[PDB]
């Protein structure tokens, strides 16, 4: 169980609905998708890295401090205002939060100190139209990009057998030169990675409790969802989009809509996910990653 | 399979004006140091190369819109000032970006309305990186010949705005070719 | 008449006499309230219903002590409703006081404001109001089962600021409209609770002994139901097209009308009155309904059908939540602040039921549809939706059509064929008063929804409160125009201004309210309605002098879009006007930005110092100086900016030389240089001069 540190140094576009939307972190779906496409391009085998590996979502970090998503636990006060405005809780204070030891003023201070990047829109045009030869409008369009301070970035949580971890490290060595976002070929999204161990993160990841904090985007398989939702606090997130090299027409190929729990849901009955298939009318199967990575407290 | 890295620096022979804000120039909203978007480089190379001849230009950048789909083979990345230029200008106390004043003459009227434009200082150096993904062995020599031709045309052309008016001329120096993934020799490939 | 209709008719008009007693001028007003209202409602043929007359005449204790009414009758329910809604020298000229001043009088008690400074009422005004209500009851009003909403509409139209109580020793802040309306709602809830529970001897049930009176006050008789709309801030802000402004006015109105039609449809299920809706606005709604197992089963069933429908149409973008928690009469009467406890409990249950929105079978049902569909709507960002002609889906095209109709036509109808898809297999289209009238005489099951029009009296009169203002319609062309109509202003840079505002101290205001003495359901209702009226009427009149268009208004959110200068000026002016309306008890938090034209309005959207020092002093100084001295355009000011932004003493000496070279009056140069020498004054100066360009 290692973590992988990511520093960017170039703006990255991550996207929700259009190109001119900017987003800070990315989900396990696009992460596994990038790993899988990099593997296929490299020509190695996918069986090893399909049904053994567990990937957690990407989360941001700052100078020396790491972050995790806000648990969706019922804190019984009544402000319900400063906490709603909080999105990430530093690791130093995680167990303090889950025991209701976080004060309103401390929450305000954390919100004040949480600057880890800013948003930008760069305007771009496209003269590929008749403009080159005849009177034709240049078509302006915008892309949403997000940048980090020189001491920031994203990090991973990965776990599995050591052989799978070695394969993952190889693939990431390959991948640091492809992208991890949107307009990869337009100049966005190259990174350097580094493997680090953290004593505090390790203790947090190997705790023992009664609840569970979901750190990835997963969906229970058909026969286990019924028992999964006995006592659950969760939010669903729709995940759609097109696919890369499935048929002749990109604009005719579009993945089937899929729904999965978010990255902060709390469950009482642990379930195992699966790599659901979201293909139809296609030559090769298309995958989406739904497999949980729990922390028990 | 393997990946080839093309790294080097570019100089502005005359001032450069990408000007995404426009009359400002593109910057980073915190560091305020000007950059060069990779979209500009990619678009100018693609236009010049296409106008130099539609399979090879399809092959390098990839269109994937015409019922047949081709993944891009050459990735451009953004640029930033070199540390050398920052040190040099700080030592010599030189402003990073100039502001030229201009006009325009109304015919039958001959009254000039002024104009203000912001221009990157001459002689700055930007750092650039290209990544090439060799997917067909028998094509690397032709592809690099084409990319050299594209660089050659770009050296004899302009980037950004008002190129016919006397800005945007650039130059390429200190270019090395290094293989970083895989086992393809990248010592017989040249880009001037 | 159905006994329930008789009960509402009696309840709403129990304290009708108070206005006439306060009138004084007329020969009727010589006797006490109850019998006064008795002869006054006997003057008209339609209101000749004897039981309603009895309800009016026997609404207090002394009359009921000798009333010899039947052991079952609505009058006793009316008595109890008025009591729960609530030495005794009543001044007939007492003016209504604003609750807002009382809301934050604990921190700073300021001279209490009174409606129409020390404003006093005149008995002639009451005479005029009585003549007006006689006119309405004579020509505009008539008792039918479906006319009760019209009665409510006229009562709101007339009485909305006449004080209900006029006790010299009590802090009067209840209008007669509020007291009457809450009395009607509470009485209806009482009637349902007693009838369903199989008690008929209501005199024996409650009037018998005071110990039982407190006992029934203590019994859990009421249910407080709250509704929350899930995804407004997202679904309203997926707009990027050229017609964006037209949709935004249509989209906010679409969500508003969704909430209105769904709440009305609910109240139809409950066989209940419109007075039962305590508060609407934003994505919220509050109701006080009967606490009956029948009520609960109906609520649950309608919730199920409702959730089905939204899952069928949007499936993530819009969802609704239901929640309710038991409350008793003792709770509403503000005994020990438990009103705030129950308010928080219902809020908490509403806010934690949103966690669990989808059962198992639903979530499975979503994930397995290999359904042949088209791609995202351009105007409306949605993958699941299927586009049609010109790459638009049905919903957004109907949005465009109703937006086109918004500016010209004022009435919206709830019809079964219509244009826009709506919850309960219904559709909304637009009408005018004349064809609406024909629809009324067509006895069609219609609900006319109006654009801030009183005195309509057309079928089911629904004066829906909404601020729909657009300066673009003030031009020579009445047709709605695009975003460029505001971009193309030549008085400054061709850009757009946007303002967002929320009342910072609102959560406590609805929850905490006026502490320990005025946290009654009546006064909370009054506070909510006054806030709604401000955020739904006054803005429309205030905006009339600005090139700005109202987009989202209502609840606690204010969204205006237009010219950069006009947005700032209107923001300051509306801030001041609001500080007047709340008497400087509630404040505004706002942020304004500048963006280029035709940018996706979706992404366009995602105090004293600034007025006195920057806008009034430094901005005026700079404007006068730049107007008197020529040749100093954006280049000179931009050199000023280069020297000021880079806070170095070398820039200051350079600026000293530049002001020496400049051809202004020496006063201007000295003031500018000395402003630049102070950090606060240099920041104010750069802000003002940036505003200049
Ligand atoms: N019809 C509307 N059009 C535009 N904005 C609206 C509309 N109705 C309400 N709003 C504003 O949008 C805000 C954001 O709505 P949001 O999606 O956050 O839901 P909400 O009603 O606040 O409840 P919750 O977030 O708890 O689900 C509301 O608080 C309200 O002020
Ligand atoms: N006219 C009104 N009557 C009753 N309740 C209202 C009215 N307008 C708004 N509200 C309610 O008051 C609540 C205020 O919560 P919200 O988070 O929207 O603002 P807030 O808490 O004041 O935010 P902030 O403190 O950050 O300014 C909302 O949930 C809304 O339902």
């Amino acid at each position: 169980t290692k973590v992988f540190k990511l520093s960017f140094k170039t703006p990255v576009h991550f996207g929700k609905k259009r190109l001119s939307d900017g987003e800070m972190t990315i989900t396990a779906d696009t992460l596994f998708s990038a790993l899988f496409i990099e593997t296929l391009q490299l020509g190695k085998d996918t069986d090893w890295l399909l049904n053994d590996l567990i990937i957690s979502d990407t989360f941001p970090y700052e100078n020396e401090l790491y972050y995790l998503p806000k648990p969706l636990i019922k804190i019984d006060s009544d402000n319900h205002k400063a906490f709603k405005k909080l999105k990430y809780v530093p690791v130093h204070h995680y167990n303090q939060y889950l025991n209701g030891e976080l004060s309103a003023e401390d929450a305000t201070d954390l919100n004040d100190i949480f600057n880890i990047g800013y948003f930008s829109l760069q305007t771009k045009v496209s003269l590929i139209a008749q403009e080159t030869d005849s009177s034709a409008d240049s078509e302006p369009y915008s892309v949403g990009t997000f940048t980090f301070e020189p001491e920031a970035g994203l990090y991973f949580i990965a776990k599995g057998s050591e052989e799978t971890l070695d394969h993952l490290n190889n693939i990431m060595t390959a991948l640091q030169y492809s992208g991890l976002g949107g307009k990869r070929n337009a100049g966005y999204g190259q990174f350097e990675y580094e493997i680090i161990n953290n004593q505090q993160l390790s203790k947090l990841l190997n705790q023992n409790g009664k609840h569970s904090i979901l750190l990835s985007t997963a969906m229970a398989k058909k026969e286990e969802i019924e028992s999964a939702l006995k006592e659950a606090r969760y939010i669903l997130t729709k995940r759609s989009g097109f696919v890369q090299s499935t048929n002749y027409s990109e604009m005719l190929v579009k993945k089937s809509d899929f729904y999965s729990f978010s990255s902060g849901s709390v469950f009482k009955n642990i379930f195992n996910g699966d790599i659901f298939n979201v293909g139809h009318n296609g030559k090769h199967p298309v995958y989406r990653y739904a497999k949980p990575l729990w922390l028990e407290v | 399979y393997s990946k080839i890295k093309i790294s080097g620096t570019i100089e502005v022979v005359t001032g450069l004006h990408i000007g995404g804000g426009g009359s400002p120039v593109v910057r980073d909203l915190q560091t305020k140091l000007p950059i060069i978007p990779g979209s500009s480089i990619k678009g100018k190379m693609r236009n010049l190369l296409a106008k130099h001849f539609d399979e090879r230009v399809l092959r390098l950048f990839g269109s994937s819109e015409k019922g047949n789909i081709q993944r891009a083979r050459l990735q451009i990345s953004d640029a930033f000032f070199s540390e050398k230029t920052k040190e040099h200008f700080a030592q010599n106390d030189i402003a990073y970006t100039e502001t030229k004043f201009e006009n325009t003459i109304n015919r039958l009227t001959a009254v000039a309305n002024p104009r203000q434009i912001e221009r990157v200082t001459r002689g700055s150096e930007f750092d650039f990186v290209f990544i090439y993904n060799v997917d067909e062995e028998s094509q690397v020599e032709d592809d690099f010949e084409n990319i050299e031709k594209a660089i050659h045309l770009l050296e004899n052309d302009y980037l950004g705005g008002g190129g016919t008016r006397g800005n945007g001329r650039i130059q390429f120096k200190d270019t090395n070719i290094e293989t970083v993934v895989g086992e393809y020799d990248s010592t017989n490939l040249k880009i001037k | 008449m159905n006994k329930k209709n008789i009960l509402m008719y009696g309840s709403l008009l129990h304290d009708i006499g108070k206005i006439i007693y306060r009138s004084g001028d007329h020969t009727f007003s010589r006797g006490t309230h109850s019998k006064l209202g008795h002869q006054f409602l006997s003057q008209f043929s339609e209101f000749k219903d004897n039981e309603v007359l009895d309800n009016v005449a026997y609404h207090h204790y002394k009359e009921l002590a000798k009333a010899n009414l039947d052991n079952d009758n609505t009058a006793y329910i009316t008595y109890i409703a008025d009591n729960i809604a609530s030495l005794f020298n009543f001044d007939k000229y007492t003016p209504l006081y604003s609750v807002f001043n009382i809301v934050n009088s604990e921190k700073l008690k300021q001279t209490n404001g009174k409606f129409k400074e020390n404003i006093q009422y005149s008995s002639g005004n009451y005479t005029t109001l009585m003549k007006d209500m006689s006119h309405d009851l004579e020509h505009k009003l008539s008792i039918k089962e479906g006319t009760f909403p019209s009665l409510l509409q006229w009562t709101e139209s007339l009485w909305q600021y006449v004080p209900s109580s006029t006790n010299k020793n009590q802090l009067i802040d209840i209008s007669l409209y509020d007291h009457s309306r809450i009395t009607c709602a509470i009485a209806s809830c009482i009637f349902d609770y007693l009838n369903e529970n199989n008690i008929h001897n209501y005199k024996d049930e409650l009037f018998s002994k005071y110990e039982n009176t407190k006992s029934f006050y203590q019994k859990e008789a009421f249910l407080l139901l709250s509704m929350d709309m899930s995804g407004i801030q997202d679904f309203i802000y997926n707009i990027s097209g050229s017609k964006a402004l037209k949709s935004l006015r249509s989209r906010s109105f679409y969500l508003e009308l969704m909430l209105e039609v769904i709440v009305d449809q609910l109240l139809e299920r409950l066989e209940l009155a419109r007075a039962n809706l305590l508060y609407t606005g934003g994505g919220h709604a509050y109701l006080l309904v009967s606490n009956t197992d029948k009520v609960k089963k109906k609520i649950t069933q309608f919730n199920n059908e409702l959730k089905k429908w939204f899952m069928s149409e949007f499936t993530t973008d819009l969802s609704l939540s239901m929640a309710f928690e038991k409350c008793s009469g003792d709770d509403l009467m503000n005994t020990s602040g438990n009103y705030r406890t129950i308010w928080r409990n219902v809020s908490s249950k509403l806010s934690d039921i949103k966690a669990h929105k989808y059962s198992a079978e639903d979530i499975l049902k979503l994930n397995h549809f290999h359904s042949y569909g088209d791609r995202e709507c351009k105007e409306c960002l949605r993958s699941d939706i299927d586009i049609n002609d010109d790459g638009l889906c049905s919903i957004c095209e109907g949005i465009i059509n109703i937006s086109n109709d918004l500016r010209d036509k004022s009435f919206f109808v709830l019809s079964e064929t219509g244009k826009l898809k709506m919850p309960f297999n219904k559709f909304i289209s637009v009408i005018d008063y004349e064809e609406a009238e024909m629809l009324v005489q067509n006895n069609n099951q219609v609900r006319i929804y109006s654009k801030n029009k009183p005195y309509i009296g057309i079928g089911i009169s629904t004066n829906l409160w909404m601020c729909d203002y657009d300066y673009a319609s003030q031009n020579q062309d009445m047709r709605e125009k695009g975003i460029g109509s505001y971009v193309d202003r030549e008085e400054g840079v061709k850009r757009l201004g946007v303002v967002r505002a929320d009342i910072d101290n609102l959560g406590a205001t609805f929850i905490s309210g006026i502490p320990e003495k005025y946290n009654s359901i009546s006064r909370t209702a009054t506070l909510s309605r006054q806030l709604s009226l401000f955020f739904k009427y006054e803005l429309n009149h205030l905006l009339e002098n600005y090139q700005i268009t109202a987009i989202y208004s209502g609840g606690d959110d204010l969204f205006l879009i237009g010219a950069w200068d006009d947005i700032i000026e209107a923001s300051i002016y509306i801030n001041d006007k609001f500080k007047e309306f709340t008497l400087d008890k509630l404040t505004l938090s706002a942020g304004v930005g500048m963006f280029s034209g035709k940018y996706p309005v979706s992404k366009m959207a995602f105090w004293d110092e600034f007025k006195k020092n920057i806008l009034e002093e430094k901005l005026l100084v700079l404007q006068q100086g730049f107007s008197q001295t020529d040749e100093h355009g954006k280049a000179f000011i931009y050199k000023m900016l280069a020297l000021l932004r880079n806070n170095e003493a070398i820039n200051i000496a350079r600026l000293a030389y530049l002001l020496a070279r400049s051809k202004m009056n020496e006063d201007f140069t000295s003031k500018i240089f000395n402003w630049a020498q102070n950090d606060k004054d240099k920041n104010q100066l750069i802000t003002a001069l940036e505003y200049y360009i």
Side-chain angles (χ1 to χ4, degrees), chain A residues 77-88:
Chain A
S77 297
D78 187 4
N79 294 336
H80 192 63
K81 178 180 69 65
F83 292 102
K84 174 63 151 313
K85 294 180 179 181
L86 183 63
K87 214 52 61 183
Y88 302 81

PDB file of all heavy atoms in Angstrom, chain A residues 77-88:
ATOM      1  N   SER A  77     -25.580  19.222  16.242  1.00  0.00           N
ATOM      2  CA  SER A  77     -25.382  20.484  16.934  1.00  0.00           C
ATOM      3  C   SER A  77     -26.554  20.764  17.865  1.00  0.00           C
ATOM      4  O   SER A  77     -27.704  20.427  17.573  1.00  0.00           O
ATOM      5  CB  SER A  77     -25.220  21.630  15.936  1.00  0.00           C
ATOM      6  OG  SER A  77     -24.069  21.447  15.129  1.00  0.00           O
ATOM      7  N   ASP A  78     -27.043  25.643  16.447  1.00  0.00           N
ATOM      8  CA  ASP A  78     -26.797  24.825  15.263  1.00  0.00           C
ATOM      9  C   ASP A  78     -26.290  25.723  14.141  1.00  0.00           C
ATOM     10  O   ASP A  78     -27.028  26.576  13.636  1.00  0.00           O
ATOM     11  CB  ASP A  78     -28.070  24.091  14.849  1.00  0.00           C
ATOM     12  CG  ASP A  78     -27.836  23.087  13.733  1.00  0.00           C
ATOM     13  OD1 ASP A  78     -26.670  22.896  13.327  1.00  0.00           O
ATOM     14  OD2 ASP A  78     -28.823  22.486  13.261  1.00  0.00           O
ATOM     15  N   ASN A  79     -25.030  25.535  13.747  1.00  0.00           N
ATOM     16  CA  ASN A  79     -24.459  26.353  12.678  1.00  0.00           C
ATOM     17  C   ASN A  79     -24.849  25.813  11.307  1.00  0.00           C
ATOM     18  O   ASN A  79     -25.557  26.477  10.543  1.00  0.00           O
ATOM     19  CB  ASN A  79     -22.935  26.414  12.826  1.00  0.00           C
ATOM     20  CG  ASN A  79     -22.501  27.154  14.073  1.00  0.00           C
ATOM     21  OD1 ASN A  79     -23.241  27.979  14.608  1.00  0.00           O
ATOM     22  ND2 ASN A  79     -21.297  26.857  14.548  1.00  0.00           N
ATOM     23  N   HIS A  80     -24.397  24.599  10.987  1.00  0.00           N
ATOM     24  CA  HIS A  80     -24.659  23.942   9.703  1.00  0.00           C
ATOM     25  C   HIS A  80     -24.290  24.835   8.514  1.00  0.00           C
ATOM     26  O   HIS A  80     -24.726  24.598   7.384  1.00  0.00           O
ATOM     27  CB  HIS A  80     -26.119  23.483   9.608  1.00  0.00           C
ATOM     28  CG  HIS A  80     -26.396  22.564   8.458  1.00  0.00           C
ATOM     29  ND1 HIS A  80     -25.805  21.324   8.337  1.00  0.00           N
ATOM     30  CD2 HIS A  80     -27.199  22.704   7.377  1.00  0.00           C
ATOM     31  CE1 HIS A  80     -26.230  20.741   7.231  1.00  0.00           C
ATOM     32  NE2 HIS A  80     -27.078  21.558   6.630  1.00  0.00           N
ATOM     33  N   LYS A  81     -23.478  25.863   8.749  1.00  0.00           N
ATOM     34  CA  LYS A  81     -23.101  26.821   7.717  1.00  0.00           C
ATOM     35  C   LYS A  81     -21.611  26.805   7.429  1.00  0.00           C
ATOM     36  O   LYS A  81     -21.211  26.649   6.271  1.00  0.00           O
ATOM     37  CB  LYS A  81     -23.533  28.235   8.135  1.00  0.00           C
ATOM     38  CG  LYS A  81     -23.144  29.319   7.147  1.00  0.00           C
ATOM     39  CD  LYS A  81     -23.609  30.683   7.626  1.00  0.00           C
ATOM     40  CE  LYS A  81     -22.823  31.127   8.849  1.00  0.00           C
ATOM     41  NZ  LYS A  81     -21.386  31.349   8.536  1.00  0.00           N
ATOM     42  N   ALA A  82     -20.775  26.969   8.454  1.00  0.00           N
ATOM     43  CA  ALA A  82     -19.335  26.917   8.240  1.00  0.00           C
ATOM     44  C   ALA A  82     -18.886  25.526   7.824  1.00  0.00           C
ATOM     45  O   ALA A  82     -17.911  25.388   7.080  1.00  0.00           O
ATOM     46  CB  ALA A  82     -18.599  27.358   9.503  1.00  0.00           C
ATOM     47  N   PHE A  83     -19.581  24.490   8.289  1.00  0.00           N
ATOM     48  CA  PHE A  83     -19.216  23.133   7.908  1.00  0.00           C
ATOM     49  C   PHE A  83     -19.661  22.795   6.496  1.00  0.00           C
ATOM     50  O   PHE A  83     -18.963  22.054   5.795  1.00  0.00           O
ATOM     51  CB  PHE A  83     -19.800  22.136   8.901  1.00  0.00           C
ATOM     52  CG  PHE A  83     -19.184  22.219  10.258  1.00  0.00           C
ATOM     53  CD1 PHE A  83     -19.836  22.864  11.292  1.00  0.00           C
ATOM     54  CD2 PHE A  83     -17.946  21.656  10.500  1.00  0.00           C
ATOM     55  CE1 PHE A  83     -19.267  22.942  12.545  1.00  0.00           C
ATOM     56  CE2 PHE A  83     -17.371  21.731  11.750  1.00  0.00           C
ATOM     57  CZ  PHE A  83     -18.032  22.375  12.774  1.00  0.00           C
ATOM     58  N   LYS A  84     -20.806  23.319   6.059  1.00  0.00           N
ATOM     59  CA  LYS A  84     -21.229  23.094   4.681  1.00  0.00           C
ATOM     60  C   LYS A  84     -20.241  23.701   3.693  1.00  0.00           C
ATOM     61  O   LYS A  84     -20.063  23.179   2.587  1.00  0.00           O
ATOM     62  CB  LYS A  84     -22.627  23.670   4.467  1.00  0.00           C
ATOM     63  CG  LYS A  84     -23.118  23.616   3.035  1.00  0.00           C
ATOM     64  CD  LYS A  84     -23.234  22.187   2.546  1.00  0.00           C
ATOM     65  CE  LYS A  84     -24.317  22.060   1.490  1.00  0.00           C
ATOM     66  NZ  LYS A  84     -25.574  22.743   1.903  1.00  0.00           N
ATOM     67  N   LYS A  85     -19.573  24.782   4.081  1.00  0.00           N
ATOM     68  CA  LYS A  85     -18.601  25.437   3.223  1.00  0.00           C
ATOM     69  C   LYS A  85     -17.254  24.736   3.217  1.00  0.00           C
ATOM     70  O   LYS A  85     -16.370  25.138   2.455  1.00  0.00           O
ATOM     71  CB  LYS A  85     -18.415  26.892   3.656  1.00  0.00           C
ATOM     72  CG  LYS A  85     -19.647  27.760   3.451  1.00  0.00           C
ATOM     73  CD  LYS A  85     -19.399  29.190   3.905  1.00  0.00           C
ATOM     74  CE  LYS A  85     -20.620  30.063   3.665  1.00  0.00           C
ATOM     75  NZ  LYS A  85     -20.385  31.475   4.074  1.00  0.00           N
ATOM     76  N   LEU A  86     -17.076  23.708   4.034  1.00  0.00           N
ATOM     77  CA  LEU A  86     -15.820  22.977   4.106  1.00  0.00           C
ATOM     78  C   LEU A  86     -15.875  21.791   3.157  1.00  0.00           C
ATOM     79  O   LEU A  86     -16.860  21.047   3.142  1.00  0.00           O
ATOM     80  CB  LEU A  86     -15.549  22.505   5.533  1.00  0.00           C
ATOM     81  CG  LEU A  86     -14.224  21.777   5.747  1.00  0.00           C
ATOM     82  CD1 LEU A  86     -13.055  22.700   5.445  1.00  0.00           C
ATOM     83  CD2 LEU A  86     -14.137  21.242   7.166  1.00  0.00           C
ATOM     84  N   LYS A  87     -14.822  21.621   2.363  1.00  0.00           N
ATOM     85  CA  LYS A  87     -14.764  20.544   1.385  1.00  0.00           C
ATOM     86  C   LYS A  87     -13.707  19.499   1.687  1.00  0.00           C
ATOM     87  O   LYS A  87     -13.928  18.317   1.422  1.00  0.00           O
ATOM     88  CB  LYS A  87     -14.518  21.117  -0.012  1.00  0.00           C
ATOM     89  CG  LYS A  87     -15.208  20.344  -1.116  1.00  0.00           C
ATOM     90  CD  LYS A  87     -16.692  20.161  -0.838  1.00  0.00           C
ATOM     91  CE  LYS A  87     -17.415  21.495  -0.742  1.00  0.00           C
ATOM     92  NZ  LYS A  87     -18.854  21.318  -0.401  1.00  0.00           N
ATOM     93  N   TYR A  88     -12.561  19.893   2.228  1.00  0.00           N
ATOM     94  CA  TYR A  88     -11.502  18.953   2.555  1.00  0.00           C
ATOM     95  C   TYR A  88     -10.984  19.217   3.957  1.00  0.00           C
ATOM     96  O   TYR A  88     -10.849  20.370   4.374  1.00  0.00           O
ATOM     97  CB  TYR A  88     -10.351  19.025   1.550  1.00  0.00           C
ATOM     98  CG  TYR A  88     -10.774  18.766   0.126  1.00  0.00           C
ATOM     99  CD1 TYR A  88     -11.342  19.762  -0.644  1.00  0.00           C
ATOM    100  CD2 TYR A  88     -10.612  17.515  -0.442  1.00  0.00           C
ATOM    101  CE1 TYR A  88     -11.731  19.521  -1.938  1.00  0.00           C
ATOM    102  CE2 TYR A  88     -10.996  17.267  -1.733  1.00  0.00           C
ATOM    103  CZ  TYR A  88     -11.555  18.272  -2.478  1.00  0.00           C
ATOM    104  OH  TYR A  88     -11.940  18.024  -3.775  1.00  0.00           O
TER     105      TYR A  88
END
